[PDB]
């Protein structure tokens, strides 16, 4: 095979270069030094440098050299709070715990701070889908409320029956 | 649209429901009518726990549904389900239901004084005041059941009322904020 399998092989090399505290860019030919891909083709260069590199949206361009992306993923409590709240208010949905745990190491600490900022769905699949407590609406009721509303049952029962009610009691 | 209506829609939306009630009709609060397929790729929830909420939005009437067909452009058809707020039955069925739990409150009061006050502990078994007197024996002088031959407590049914009278304060006080909003919406 060719032109295909490469990119897989330097996108894990800049990852784990970045897990070891390298901030700074890199060059492309920086990177194939120690890829063993000193033999790679000129075609893919250009290719890499048109195409690869920036579509990926864990790479950015500073003054020409690429680098991880450390400020879109979540690396800090703030970060957290803070796009959790943008997702909530332009509607574009939660994230998933696995997301947050790949991109934030120790991510239980920041969920035991925030503690009931954050919302949990169980997905079958034993996943978790984190979503905002918008605070501005906070009402709740004791259990035996929830039993006796549950208790009542609406599904089963045709609309002339609602209508009529209405009149019954005298309202 | 007057926002009094969203703002009642979202004070009974979650309070007596789930947070994702709550954020399904806020995407309808956004926009009068959502398409089903543009509303399961906002969310990105499950397809199956996400319809029932639907099917559960169905049975108290919050919204309605119509639906149209058309061809696409690889000719297939298709059946979108198309879903708009429509709050005049809203506000019937929180009238309704608003009702129903008032009306809940004094059957609830009359079948607290209704209640058997008689208990056997050997046969587990509630018995009626009046079959209390059947049950006596005139030839032993003294009250015991038939079946099991022993001493009536009367205590355990006086503590179920008790409990139930303190939570019509807290009942009557927790209401008055929805039933300002039934007010400032009858015109
Ligand atoms: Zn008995």
Same mark, same amino acid.
């Given at each position: ?99 947050? %745990? ?60 609602? %209508? ?8 | ?5 969203? &703002? ?7 309070? @007596? ?15 009068? $009518?959502?398409? %089903? %397929? ?12 996400? &319809? ?9 009437? @919050? ?20 879903? @708009? ?16 739990? &008032? ?14 006050? @008689?208990? $056997?502990?050997?046969?587990?078994? +509630? ?14 002088? +003294?009250?015991? $059941? ?36 039934? &007010?400032?919406?009858?015109?």
């Amino acid at each position: 095979g060719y032109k295909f399998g490469v990119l897989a092989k330097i996108v894990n090399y800049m990852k784990t270069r970045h897990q070891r505290g390298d901030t700074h860019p890199l060059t492309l030919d920086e990177i194939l030094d120690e890829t063993q891909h000193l033999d790679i083709g000129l075609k893919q260069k250009q290719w890499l440098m048109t195409e690869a590199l920036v579509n990926n949206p864990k790479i950015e361009v500073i003054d020409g050299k690429y680098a991880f992306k450390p400020k879109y993923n979540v690396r800090d409590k703030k970060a957290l709070l803070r796009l959790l709240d943008q997702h909530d208010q332009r509607g574009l949905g939660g994230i998933l715990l696995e997301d947050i %745990e790949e991109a934030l190491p120790n991510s239980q600490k920041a969920v035991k701070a925030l503690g009931d900022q954050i919302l949990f769905v169980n997905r079958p699949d034993k996943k978790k889908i984190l979503f905002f407590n918008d605070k501005s609406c906070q009402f709740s009721v004791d259990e035996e409320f929830q039993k006796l509303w549950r208790s009542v049952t609406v599904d089963s029962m045709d609309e002339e029956k609602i %209508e009529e009610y209405l009149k019954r009691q005298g309202i | 649209v007057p926002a009094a209506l969203k &703002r009642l829609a979202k004070y009974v939306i979650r309070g @007596f429901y789930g947070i994702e009630h709550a954020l399904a009709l806020d995407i309808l609060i956004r926009n009068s $009518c959502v398409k %089903e %397929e543009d509303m399961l790729e906002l969310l990105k929830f499950d397809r199956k726990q996400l &319809r029932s909420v639907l099917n559960n939005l169905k049975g108290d009437k @919050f919204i309605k549904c119509r639906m149209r067909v058309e061809t696409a452009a690889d000719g297939k058809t298709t059946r979108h389900n198309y879903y @708009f707020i429509n709050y005049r039955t809203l506000v019937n069925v929180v009238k309704y239901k608003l009702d129903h739990m &008032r009306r809940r409150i004094e059957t609830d009061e009359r079948d607290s004084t209704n209640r058997a006050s @008689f208990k $056997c502990p050997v046969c587990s078994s +509630t018995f009626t005041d009046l079959e209390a007197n059947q049950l006596f024996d005139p030839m032993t002088g +003294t009250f015991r $059941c038939t079946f099991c031959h022993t001493e009536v407590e009367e205590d355990e049914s006086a503590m179920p009322k008790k409990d139930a009278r303190t939570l019509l304060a807290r009942f009557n006080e927790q209401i008055e904020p929805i039933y300002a909003l039934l &007010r400032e919406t009858e015109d």
